[PDB]
Amino acid sequence: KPKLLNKFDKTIKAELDAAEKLRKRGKIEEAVNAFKELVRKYPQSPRARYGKAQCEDDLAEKRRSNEVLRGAIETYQEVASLPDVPADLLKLSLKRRSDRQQFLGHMRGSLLTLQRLVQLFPNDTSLKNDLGVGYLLIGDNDNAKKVYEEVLSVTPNDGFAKVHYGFILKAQNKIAESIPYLKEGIESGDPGTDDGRFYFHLGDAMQRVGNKEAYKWYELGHKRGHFASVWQRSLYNVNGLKAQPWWTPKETGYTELVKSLERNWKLIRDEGLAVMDKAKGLFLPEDENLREKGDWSQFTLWQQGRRNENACKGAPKTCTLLEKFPETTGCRRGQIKYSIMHPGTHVWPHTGPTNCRLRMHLGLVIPKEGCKIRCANETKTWEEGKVLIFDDSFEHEVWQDASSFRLIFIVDVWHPELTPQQRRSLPAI
Ligand SMILES: O=C(O)CNC(=O)C(=O)O
Ligand SMILES: [Mn+2]
C-alpha cells in the first residue's frame, strides 16, 4: 500500500521490479549492479537510487562491515535530493537512514536527519516521537521533553510519548510523577511500549516511593518475556542456568575457594583495613543511584577478569591467595572487591546485569546488630569469617543500621553450570 513511484518511475516498472526481485531472491550483487546501472540510464530515478541503498543496506548485513553501510546512508540521503520524490519513499528513505545512523552510533547525525523529517512532515506524530528519541540518544533530555509535550498536547493518549515522558521525568528525579505516565503508556499497548526498559523504570520508580505494587508489574514483565522471573531480572543471560537466590558452598562446587576465603579471613580483613587506614582514597564511592542514603565505598582488586596491579600492591597476600582460583579471577562478568558500608545506609532493591555469575560475600568486620541483606524473599546476615553466596541477578536489598562500620569481601565466580567453552567465549560485563 505504499506509493514509491513518481510520474517517471511508473514507466520503467518492469525493470525496477526485476532488480527488486533479484534482491528478494537473495542474489544481491546483481540487484546492486542492476540498480547501480539504472541511475546512469535515468539519473532522476528515486526508486532506483533507493533500491541501490537497500542493496547496500542488505549487503551491509551480509558482509557485516560498517563501511558499506556508511555508503547506504549517503545513498538514502541522495534519494531525498531528487526532483520529484513520492512522500512515502522520501519518508522511508530518511527514516531508514536515521535508523542506520543510530546503529553506527552517529547519534547527532541521526538527530539531524530526524529534524529534517519532522519539518518535512509536520503532521506525522510518529516522526515527532522518533525525534524525541533522537534527542534522548545525545543526552538532550530537555529538548526531548519539549517534543513529547508537543505530541501529548495534540495527542493526549499516545502511549509511546507517555512512557518516554515518564522516563524523562524519572531521570529528572520526579519519581512519583513519572509513574502514572509509565503505567498508562504500557497499558496503552501502543507500538514501542512493550519494552523491558519501561517495566524496569516503572518498577524501580514504584519501589523508591514504597509502592508494593511494583512486583505486580515485574510479574507482568516476566509474562511478556522481559524478565526471567518476578525476582530474576538481569539483562544479559544464558538460558538453562540453575536459578535460585541463595546457594550453599557445596551447591556451587567451589568448596576450595570458600574454604580458602574462610580460613584466611583475618588476613584478608587486615590488608583491607590497612588500605582503609593508609590509603583511604582507594576506596571509591559505590553506585550513587543505588544508594538512598548513607556511606558506601569499594576497593577493587579484580574487574572483568583483569587484575588491578596498583590495588594488589595494597593487598599483596590477598591477591596472591586469589590467583589460585581462576573461577573468580578469570570471571570476565564479575569483580573482586572490598566493600565498606557505614551506619545509616540503605541500598535500593536492585539486580545485577547477568545471570552468568554467583556472588560470594566474606564477612570481615560485622557489627553484632543492624546489618542485613535480602535476596528475593529471604533476608540474611553476614558472619565474620563466613561466606554468603547469592545470585545477584535476583533482586537484593541492603541495610546498615549498626553503630560502627561493616566490611565485607565480595568475590564473583562463574555460574558453576557454565561450560569451559562458555566461560572462554562470553563477552565481558
Ligand atoms: O556491599 C554491600 O553490602 C552491597 N552489595 C551488593 O549489593 C552486591 O554484592 O551485589
Ligand atoms: Mn548488588
UniProtKB/Swiss-Prot annotation:
Glycosylation site residues: N123, N377
Residues on Lumenal side: 1-429
Protein name: Aspartyl/asparaginyl beta-hydroxylase
GO cellular component: calcium channel complex; cortical endoplasmic reticulum; endoplasmic reticulum; endoplasmic reticulum membrane; junctional sarcoplasmic reticulum membrane; plasma membrane; sarcoplasmic reticulum lumen; sarcoplasmic reticulum membrane
Subunit (UniProt): Monomer. Isoform 8 interacts with ORAI1 and STIM1. Isoform 4 interacts with CASQ2.
Cofactor(s) needed by this chain: Fe cation
Protein family according to the UniProt entry: Belongs to the aspartyl/asparaginyl beta-hydroxylase family.
Substrates-to-products reaction catalysed: L-aspartyl-[protein] + 2-oxoglutarate + O2 = 3-hydroxy-L-aspartyl-[protein] + succinate + CO2
Tissue spec: Isoform 1 is detected in all tissues tested. Isoform 8 is mainly expressed in pancreas, heart, brain, kidney and liver. Isoform 8 is expressed in kidney (at protein level).
Residue pairs linked by disulfide bridges in the UniProt entry: C312-C319
Positions bound to 2-oxoglutarate: W296, S339, R359, M360, H361, R406
Superkingdom: Eukaryota
EC number, UniProt record: 1.14.11.16
Disease implication from the record: Facial dysmorphism, lens dislocation, anterior segment abnormalities, and spontaneous filtering blebs: A syndrome characterized by dislocated crystalline lenses and anterior segment abnormalities in association with a distinctive facies involving flat cheeks and a beaked nose. Some affected individuals develop highly unusual non-traumatic conjunctival cysts (filtering blebs).
Residues bound to Fe cation: H350, H396
Gene that specifies this protein: ASPH
Top EC class, one word: oxidoreductase
One example of a Gene Ontology biological process annotation: calcium ion transmembrane transport
Keyword Metal-binding attributed: yes
TPR repeats: 12-45, 125-158, 160-192, 196-228
Keywords: Calcium, Dioxygenase, Disease variant, Disulfide bond, Endoplasmic reticulum, Glycoprotein, Iron, Membrane, Metal-binding, Oxidoreductase, Phosphoprotein, Repeat, Sarcoplasmic reticulum, Signal-anchor, TPR repeat, Transmembrane, Transmembrane helix
GO molecular function: calcium ion binding; electron transfer activity; peptidyl-aspartic acid 3-dioxygenase activity; structural constituent of muscle; structural molecule activity; transmembrane transporter binding
Ribosomal protein found in the keyword field: no
